[PDB]
Design a protein around this nucleic acid. Structure first.
Ligand SMILES: [Zn+2]
Lengths: 191, 59, 91, 84, 95
RNA sequence: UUUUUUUACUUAUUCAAUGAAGCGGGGCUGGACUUGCGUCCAACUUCUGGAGUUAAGGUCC
RNA sequence: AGGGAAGUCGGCAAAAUAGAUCCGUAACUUCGGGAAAAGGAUUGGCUCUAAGGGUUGGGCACGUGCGUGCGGUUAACAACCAACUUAGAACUGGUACGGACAGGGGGAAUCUGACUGUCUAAUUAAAACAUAGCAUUGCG
RNA sequence: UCGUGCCCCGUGUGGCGAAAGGGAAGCCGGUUAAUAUUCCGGCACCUGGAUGUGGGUUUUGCGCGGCAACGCAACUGAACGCGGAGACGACGGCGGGGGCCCCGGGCAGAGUUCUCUUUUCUUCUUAACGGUCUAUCACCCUGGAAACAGUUUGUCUGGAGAU
RNA sequence: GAAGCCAGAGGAAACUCUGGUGGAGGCUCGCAGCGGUUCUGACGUGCAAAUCGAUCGUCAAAUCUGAGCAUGGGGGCGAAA
């Protein structure tokens, strides 16, 4: 892992217009089931250009132009505030608050559905992958489409080695010893 | 570090982006640059025509 | 000459892991190891490099896709309703 | 021995520009020019001025580093500061 | 209908299939029509459109892929762009 | 003058982001409704895996 | 020697099997296996035979060792060079021919844990642990 | 020069941490009782600095040639940027090269020799650093392929231009 | 001897059969290594405060291993004894 998968910081260009980036690489992130996309944008304030790391939505490809901003079009890979999309649109990496660079709908094959808008208070009702309903500020951003790599869990792991390879880079506790197999001093289930 | 000991024409090709990009990519860069600036001129002409038509309609 | 009756690519696993589990894994292995037609250049050279990552050997395009297939039906249907919503918004 | 780095010896150590000399002495420009005229510090010309300063032009003035080091011990500096 | 017209041109008229022969036809200035497949790379598409604009040659954007354009031409290989030099007995030029 | 309820506020306190870069309010221009001129809403880049940096210029000295 | 588990709690230990070529191989099965299942025929030495390769090389007519215009696919022919396998046959010694060495005994079943893997260093390697698969709970 | 100022830029913060990771550069012969890619002899290389000579460039100021891939002893290049190298898993068979092993001849030496054995054995070597001519992939030019072709042990490649 | 691939024979096609090719597997016999099943084994004030012989398990990986570094006793670590 090199960089976290985050949106650009919410700046003037994304707040008032759109800024274009180019997708250079689609790479594998160890410990994550979804691919990442390296996207290069221009800096509006200096000559050097800025490289970002996004969670890649399905259908994204190398050499593709994507657009981030309020006035961006409704196309897969574009990053828009939730007030700029219609109801029924699914999005990925949805910010909980405008500016935290993405919190919701990030794993492979997952998305967040825009259920509705309350334009008077500037709120948006969304449906989460677990089925929960949430209300977020309408200026929260999201990337149009579904996170790539869907259907990963359908294939059986089939082997203790494949489970070990999965969890070694994930740091999760493996193998798992049952608490009932322990002594009474080791676990409350021990004995 | 062995590249610091050899002369410049051995480390490059006598072409734009020589020793950094290959000939096919340089040709693609030239054609893409020319076509995109021509399209920018065309789009600016079309925008000026539409602006003149809108100004004539408003006036 | 067909060498196995039913196991196919799952024949590398022998008698282990159970018949239903081998049959379940067989679909994913077949789809993840098949070659696909590139939507950009039209050649049958698109293959998986990592999970969700599909690259074309000819035109060198790399595409974010499904875990074991190039596209998922959910994403294809999503593209269809996205086109419908974009048409409604523009019109 | 350990490998030397480029630009750490030779004319780069031998010459200093007027800007570098003024910053080394922490003087103003009129005081520096006054002190150079009074102490006999003369402009010098390196064989290759890019070896001394990569932004140097044909109008860049160079001095001997040892001459500026000698100027560091002139008692007129404290007189300048006392008058200010 | 464009497939039927294309089949008529293959049967009666004269065509060249492929990028380099299409460019040679446009340079010669005897090309009557250019067909560009949908999945042709945008750089090559812009280059072909510029050549056809400078030679005053009509351009048809074929909605199929290069596989479909080759099948429409009646070949067993793909074709991203092609040039009609002689219409033959077809009315593909009248459009 | 004081006790409860809710009902606003910001200055204590708390959280987050940024290279603390474009916040708030006006002006100019265009579009809509309105009253017969007040709101709100918009300025700016979308065929292409190019390039974009040392201000060109105008006008007073 | 003869007998062949009569020994012993118990075939413990030992003996028997073993390489390779060929014939042949059951129930059961998650169809992948079981399987080297089982059960058989052979193996030395010598003198021969057969099969399996490589390299180089075409006639005319002009300009002059190269360029054309031809013409022909029996080079299916010559010259030179080279190695290790495989199959077949005769003859011959024999108490032995995988002559030392090296090298599965096999079969019918029952219980049991799915399997590969792991632990009580210095009395317990296992029906214990782990495992993939499955199910539940909590968290926006 | 209102002489005691003005301008530009943004990226943060230092150190330790590998005699198996990364990394500038040395080979051969000889030499001691005991050290040697360290000593001696011969023949080289790397890094940094200064400043000459020759050659090059220029009066069309910052080279020329090739359609091209690109070549050639040179052949300006600050700020600010882009890119490459450093820099990378495991396993499988296939092909090239060094060294080793094996076979034949020849000179020289040694052993065997009742008989046999034109016999059996030993030496027959060539460094770093350079020059020159070559070596799979790949790329360029012509041209336009179905009666599809090329092609690996392994079926990949081609009108996105194969043979 | 798994996918993939070639050829031949069928089949309207899907597919079916035959012969090759290929080289998969927490597959298997087995050398080193790693481990430690058995033996009225050797040894029993030993060569050894756990060693020796034969035999055995595993042997391309959940394999074996060095150095650097991290976790410290109300703790750690633990495929859990
Ligand atoms: Zn492609």
């Amino acid at each position: 892992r090199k960089a976290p998968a985050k949106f650009r910081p919410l700046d003037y260009a994304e707040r008032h217009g759109y800024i274009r980036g180019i997708v250079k690489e689609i790479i594998h992130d160890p410990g994550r089931g979804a691919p990442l996309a390296r996207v290069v944008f221009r800096s509006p304030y200096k000559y050097k250009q800025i490289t970002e790391t996004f969670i890649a939505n399905e259908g994204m490809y190398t050499g593709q132009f994507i657009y981030a901003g309020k006035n961006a079009a409704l196309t897969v890979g574009n990053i828009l505030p939730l007030s700029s999309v219609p109801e029924g649109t699914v999005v990925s990496n949805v910010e909980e608050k405008p500016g935290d660079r993405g919190a919701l709908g990030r794993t492979s094959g997952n998305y967040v559905t825009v259920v509705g808008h309350n334009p008077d208070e500037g709120k948006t009702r969304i449906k989460l992958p677990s089925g929960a309903k949430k209300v977020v500020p309408s200026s929260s951003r999201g990337m149009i489409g579904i996170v790539a790599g869907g259907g990963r869990t359908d294939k059986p792991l089939l082997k203790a080695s494949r489970a070990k390879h999965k969890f070694a880079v994930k740091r999760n506790r493996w193998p798992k010893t049952r608490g009932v197999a322990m002594n009474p001093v080791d676990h409350p289930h021990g004995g | 570090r062995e590249y610091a000991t050899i002369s410049k024409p051995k480390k490059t090709v006598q072409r734009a982006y020589g020793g950094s990009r290959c000939g096919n990519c340089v040709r693609d860069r030239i054609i893409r640059a020319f076509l995109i600036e021509e399209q920018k001129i065309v789009k600016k002409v079309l925008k000026e025509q539409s602006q003149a038509e809108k100004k004539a309609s408003k006036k | 000459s067909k060498r196995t009756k039913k196991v196919g690519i799952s024949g590398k696993y022998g008698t282990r892991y159970g018949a239903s589990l081998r049959k379940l894994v067989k679909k994913q292995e077949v789809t993840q190891h098949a070659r696909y037609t590139c939507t950009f250049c039209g050649k049958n050279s698109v293959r998986r490099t990592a999970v969700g990552i599909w690259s074309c050997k000819s035109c060198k395009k790399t595409m974010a896709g499904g875990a074991y297939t190039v596209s998922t039906p959910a994403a294809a249907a999503m593209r269809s309703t996205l086109r419908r919503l974009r048409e409604i918004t523009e019109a | 021995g350990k490998a030397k780095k480029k630009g750490k010896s030779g004319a780069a150590r031998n010459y200093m520009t007027r800007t570098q000399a003024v910053k080394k002495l922490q003087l103003s420009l009129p005081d520096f020019r006054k002190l150079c005229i009074w102490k006999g510090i003369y402009p010098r010309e390196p064989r290759d001025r890019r070896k001394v300063n990569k932004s140097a032009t044909a109008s860049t003035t160079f001095y001997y580093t040892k001459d500026i080091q000698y100027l560091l011990h002139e008692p007129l500096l404290q007189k300048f500061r006392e008058q200010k | 209908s464009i497939g039927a017209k294309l089949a008529l041109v293959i049967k009666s008229g004269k065509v060249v299939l492929g990028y380099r022969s299409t460019l040679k036809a446009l340079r010669s200035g005897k090309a009557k029509l250019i067909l560009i497949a949908a999945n042709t790379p945008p750089l090559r598409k812009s280059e072909l459109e510029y050549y056809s604009m400078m030679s005053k040659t009509p351009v048809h954007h074929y909605s199929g892929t290069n596989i479909e354009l080759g099948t429409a031409c009646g070949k067993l290989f793909r074709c991203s762009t092609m040039a009609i030099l002689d219409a033959g007995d077809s009315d593909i030029l009248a459009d």
